[PDB]
Design an enzyme around this catalytic site. Sequence first.
Site, PDB file in Angstrom:
ATOM      1  N   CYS B  38      29.493  17.538  33.223  1.00  0.00           N
ATOM      2  CA  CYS B  38      31.132  17.390  33.670  1.00  0.00           C
ATOM      3  C   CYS B  38      31.152  16.686  32.275  1.00  0.00           C
ATOM      4  O   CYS B  38      32.668  17.636  31.881  1.00  0.00           O
ATOM      5  CB  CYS B  38      30.830  16.146  34.747  1.00  0.00           C
ATOM      6  SG  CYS B  38      30.018  14.601  33.523  1.00  0.00           S
ATOM      7  N   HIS B  92      30.410  10.657  35.917  1.00  0.00           N
ATOM      8  CA  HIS B  92      30.789  11.780  35.462  1.00  0.00           C
ATOM      9  C   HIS B  92      32.146  11.014  35.307  1.00  0.00           C
ATOM     10  O   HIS B  92      32.324   9.902  35.310  1.00  0.00           O
ATOM     11  CB  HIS B  92      30.709  12.076  37.681  1.00  0.00           C
ATOM     12  CG  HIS B  92      31.718  13.417  38.017  1.00  0.00           C
ATOM     13  ND1 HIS B  92      31.278  14.363  37.176  1.00  0.00           N
ATOM     14  CD2 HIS B  92      32.656  13.547  38.255  1.00  0.00           C
ATOM     15  CE1 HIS B  92      31.722  15.133  37.963  1.00  0.00           C
ATOM     16  NE2 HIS B  92      32.781  15.053  38.180  1.00  0.00           N
ATOM     17  N   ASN B 104      38.204  18.758  37.040  1.00  0.00           N
ATOM     18  CA  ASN B 104      36.845  18.246  37.346  1.00  0.00           C
ATOM     19  C   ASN B 104      35.573  18.945  37.033  1.00  0.00           C
ATOM     20  O   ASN B 104      36.072  20.194  37.678  1.00  0.00           O
ATOM     21  CB  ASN B 104      35.828  17.229  37.232  1.00  0.00           C
ATOM     22  CG  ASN B 104      35.755  17.142  39.097  1.00  0.00           C
ATOM     23  OD1 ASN B 104      34.498  16.762  39.812  1.00  0.00           O
ATOM     24  ND2 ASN B 104      36.700  17.744  39.776  1.00  0.00           N
TER      25      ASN B 104
END
Lengths: 155, 134
Positions: B38, B92, B104
């Site tokens: 990520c 995240h 993302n």
Amino acid sequence: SGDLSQKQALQLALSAREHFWNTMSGHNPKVKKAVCPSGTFEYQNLQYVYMCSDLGTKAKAVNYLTPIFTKTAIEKGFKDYHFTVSKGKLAVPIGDGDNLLNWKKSTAKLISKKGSTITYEFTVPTLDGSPSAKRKVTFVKENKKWKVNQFDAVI
Amino acid sequence: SGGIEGAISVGSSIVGQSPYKFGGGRTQSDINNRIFDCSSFVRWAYASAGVNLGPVGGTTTDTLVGRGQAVSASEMKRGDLVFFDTYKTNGHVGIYLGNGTFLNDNTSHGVSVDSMSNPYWKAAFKGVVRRVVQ
């Protein structure tokens, strides 16, 4: 015996997931009172941290993974994720991940049986409601046990 | 091809073509293959557009929360970094697109666009936002 059921395949997959996550994380949470060396180093243009003591050497990590991953899978997993030994200690690059796949609620469909291998395709619901994920896992009979043949097959 | 719009364009160009590489996206091989985690995805998209969010090998969610300027959720803009609590605080990260979506890379389908009002992501978001282009 010579077979692996849907129920058994999922239980093995969940063990592989836990072992992969714990090894990438540097620690098995169920080993209490382990010590975790602090400090980082650069190697191969990557930033590394040290494994905690319960996985502190390559030998300790190999023994941790042996019950659930094949010998080839363990060796290729160390290589694929760039594990290294520094000053006698096992180390792993920094990085990120998530656990959106709800493997414990997945279903398994048999795809293949060839030789001493069995392949299941898992349909894995997600924690965020994105479309359920398709994930193939191949199990190989090794030392009388069914073992996952890819270190990163269950994430 | 630069700045916020360049980062979003480059990042969006591999939606559906970039499976998540757990802990990866920092080797030359991963970058060649356009596979990331990520944070290395966010770093790569902005670096492709000329915005330095940190060195390739050292940039993670942990370091990205220290980049740019903290802004409140109420003033968040297209291009801001949005952080989410998954298995840990700020575990995240994505790029806010405006209009309630964010770009993302996550394990379920790799590089993708998700909704801030998705119940899971809405609960995961605690208001931590970083503006990296003024």
